[PDB]
Write a protein that binds this ligand. Structure first.
Ligand code: IR4
Length: 116
């Protein structure tokens, strides 16, 4: 509360650590469905069904331009890429499998870096 804080966490490396994490996502073999915005002209249903499209290049533009105020906001956009993927793709498809694989990959790094 007012004049009563928890001990200050060093948050000065978070930008760099999120960039590193995102670079590891971008270069994974199964990232290809997520690297660019889905082409809303070319994919029927996407625009109406997916209320908040998201992708790695958009995440990278946001991060590099100071648009995440904190860690939580960066991890919300990352998860949204996979939440979207699940909403739109069957689990038993190449892209649905990529999505599951990339979330797992993300969450491990996310825990190793900021939890453990
Ligand atoms: C993320 C997602 O749902 C997605 C990502 C792709 C994609 C990204 C890069 C290159 C090729 N495909 C894609 C492609 C889709 N289609 C391919 C063309 O036929 C219509 C469906 C449907 C959904 N998607």
């Amino acid at each position: 509360s007012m004049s009563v804080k928890k001990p200050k966490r060093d948050d000065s490396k978070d930008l760099a650590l999120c960039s590193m994490i995102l670079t590891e996502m971008e270069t994974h073999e199964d990232a290809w469905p997520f690297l660019l915005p889905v082409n809303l002209k070319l994919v029927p249903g996407y625009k109406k069904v997916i209320k908040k499209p998201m992708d790695f290049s958009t995440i990278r533009e946001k991060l590099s331009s100071g648009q995440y105020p904190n860690l939580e906001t960066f991890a919300l956009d990352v998860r949204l890429v996979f939440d979207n993927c699940e909403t739109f793709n069957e689990d038993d498809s190449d892209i649905g499998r990529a999505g599951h694989n990339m979330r797992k990959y993300f969450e491990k790094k996310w825990t190793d870096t900021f939890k453990v």
